[PDB]
């Protein structure tokens, strides 16, 4: 629930005209998600 | 010769399954296999009778032999993955499930279970997605902190590890503590990262101090979600009371098992990678055993396979290294007792088991009364074996939130070294 | 391959100080992945 609510808040905050406090964390989350979806593990 | 004694235990052991008699079914299954350990049919039939008794660990290996002897035995193949799922880990169950369509055609209900098994690995994947001396004010503040989640500052933890390593490196392998006629001492069993149970221990039996000495028999980490808090609090306790708080090395204080049973992952999630390296460095200096009054000798593992084994040999042990595959320290961290006489291969796969004769010989040769060793989960929180010469104490109630077992700690008196078991309960976190 | 390329370029544009002109498509892609990873077929 913590991960889900954090990701929802980040995406909603992005798609409303605001600016993120640190893009690096969101980018890393997206990269980890893609890596999970394409099978690298570890 | 003995081929006839195969089917005679088939119509009997399997019949008890109809009468819900899983116990006698297992007892009779341990007879046909005993006189015929080459039939996969019985190795498969034993799996259902042993799995319905909420015992998954041994059934996991029991279901494998029904597959090795016959790879066409789907009956014994499904239950291996079923036991793996009962344990809860992924991969093995999923691999077993997917290794059924390559042996069968497009049959009904064959792939539905494989898809159902797939539907949980996805959930798992989404889950992936003062002056540096420690004071009473500091210990109370850190205790309340850990009670309210929150990680300790990295500098304070590093200082705690450095100081505890410096203190522990000056202690012999066999710590000799002399207890007066009065002034009892507390011995606790495995903790395994149950900080909220350690809170109950300290509240029920009093906070550790010079008047109420404490000593824990290893296993402060692994299989728990609060291992870091437990071990850091115990290190602070050792720092504050070096002469009244004693930590004994355990089998779960090893890197090969820290990296598999969550402690390494917990440290890397809460702190840096080198911070677990310093955990390992300070873990190797923990004593393996402690002797009280020259009468009560306590250790996390127990006795050895070698027959000589003296206290001087215990003192001459190099602690600062990883445990060997066999030898003194391996049994000092892995042995178990056996109700029958003589040695045997340990169920854990390493070390061995010691009988009552081994315990009696060790106590007679080392001039000791009895031995205390936890290493294990007990339903009542303590166990008496070998006629009282073997004592087991457990301080981890509700081990993995599934066992639901009580826990206990031992009060030992200088005037009377008889163990005084005191029991506590779940105390949910 | 096309989806991965577009998502990679969009994330790189996000993380390099630039401003995205159509954040709703990015949010839609994130939602598609989140439903693909948490059960519901559609």
Swiss-Prot record, chains A, C:
PTM comment: Ubiquitinated in the presence of STUB1-UBE2D1 complex (in vitro). ISGylated.
Domain of life: Eukaryota
Positions bearing Phosphoserine: 19
Compartment(s) where it occurs, according to its Swiss-Prot or TrEMBL record: Cytoplasm; Melanosome; Nucleus; Secreted
Coiled coil (UniProt feature): none
Stated induction or repression of this protein's expression: By heat shock.
Free-text domain note: The TPR repeat-binding motif mediates interaction with TPR repeat-containing proteins.
Family: Belongs to the heat shock protein 90 family.
Subunit structure, interactors included: Monomer. Homodimer. Forms a complex with CDK6 and CDC37. Interacts with UNC45A; binding to UNC45A involves 2 UNC45A monomers per HSP90AB1 dimer. Interacts with CHORDC1. Interacts with DNAJC7. Interacts with FKBP4. May interact with NWD1. Interacts with SGTA. Interacts with HSF1 in an ATP-dependent manner. Interacts with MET; the interaction suppresses MET kinase activity. Interacts with ERBB2 in an ATP-dependent manner; the interaction suppresses ERBB2 kinase activity. Interacts with HIF1A, KEAP1 and RHOBTB2. Interacts with STUB1 and SMAD3. Interacts with XPO1 and AHSA1. Interacts with BIRC2. (Microbial infection) Protein on the cell surface interacts with N.meningitidis serogroup B adhesin A (nadA).
Function: Molecular chaperone that promotes the maturation, structural maintenance and proper regulation of specific target proteins involved for instance in cell cycle control and signal transduction. Undergoes a functional cycle linked to its ATPase activity. This cycle probably induces conformational changes in the client proteins, thereby causing their activation. Interacts dynamically with various co-chaperones that modulate its substrate recognition, ATPase cycle and chaperone function. (Microbial infection) Binding to N.meningitidis NadA stimulates monocytes. Seems to interfere with N.meningitidis NadA-mediated invasion of human cells.
Protein name listed in UniProt: Heat shock protein HSP 90-beta
Native organism: Homo sapiens
UniProtKB/Swiss-Prot annotation, chain B:
Record organism: Homo sapiens
Chain residues that bind Mn(2+) 2: 219, 251, 300, 375
Entry keyword Ribosomal protein: no
Cofactor or coenzyme needed: Mg(2+); Mn(2+)
Catalytic activity: O-phospho-L-seryl-[protein] + H2O = L-seryl-[protein] + phosphate; O-phospho-L-threonyl-[protein] + H2O = L-threonyl-[protein] + phosphate
Name of protein: Serine/threonine-protein phosphatase 5
Subunit structure: Probably forms a complex composed of chaperones HSP90 and HSP70, co-chaperones STIP1/HOP, CDC37, PPP5C, PTGES3/p23, TSC1 and client protein TSC2. Probably forms a complex composed of chaperones HSP90 and HSP70, co-chaperones CDC37, PPP5C, TSC1 and client protein TSC2, CDK4, AKT, RAF1 and NR3C1; this complex does not contain co-chaperones STIP1/HOP and PTGES3/p23. Part of a complex with HSP90/HSP90AA1 and steroid receptors. Interacts (via TPR repeats) with HSP90AA1 (via TPR repeat-binding motif) or HSPA1A/HSPA1B; the interaction is direct and activates the phosphatase activity.
GO MF assignments: ADP binding; ATP binding; G-protein alpha-subunit binding; Hsp70 protein binding; Hsp90 protein binding; identical protein binding; lipid binding; metal ion binding
EC id: 3.1.3.16
Residues annotated for Mn(2+) 1 binding in this entry: 190, 192, 219
Uppermost EC category: hydrolase
Description of how activity is regulated: Autoinhibited. In the autoinhibited state, the TPR domain interacts with the catalytic region and prevents substrate access to the catalytic pocket. Allosterically activated by various polyunsaturated fatty acids, free long-chain fatty-acids and long-chain fatty acyl-CoA esters, arachidonic acid being the most effective activator. HSP90A and probably RAC1, GNA12 and GNA13 can also release the autoinhibition by the TPR repeat. Activation by RAC1, GNA12 and GNA13 is synergistic with the one produced by fatty acids binding. Inhibited by okadaic acid.
Gene Ontology terms: biological process: cellular response to cadmium ion; cellular response to hydrogen peroxide; DNA-templated transcription; double-strand break repair; MAPK cascade; mitotic cell cycle; negative regulation of apoptotic process; negative regulation of MAPK cascade
Broad class of the protein's primary localization: nucleus
CDD domains named in the record: MPP_PP5_C
Keywords associated with the record: Acetylation, Alzheimer disease, Amyloid, Amyloidosis, Cell membrane, Cytoplasm, DNA damage, DNA repair, Hydrolase, Lipid-binding, Magnesium, Manganese, Membrane, Metal-binding, Neurodegeneration, Nucleus, Protein phosphatase, Repeat, TPR repeat
Family: Belongs to the PPP phosphatase family. PP-5 (PP-T) subfamily.
SUPFAM superfamilies found in the cross-reference section: Metallo-dependent phosphatases (SSF56300), TPR-like (SSF48452)
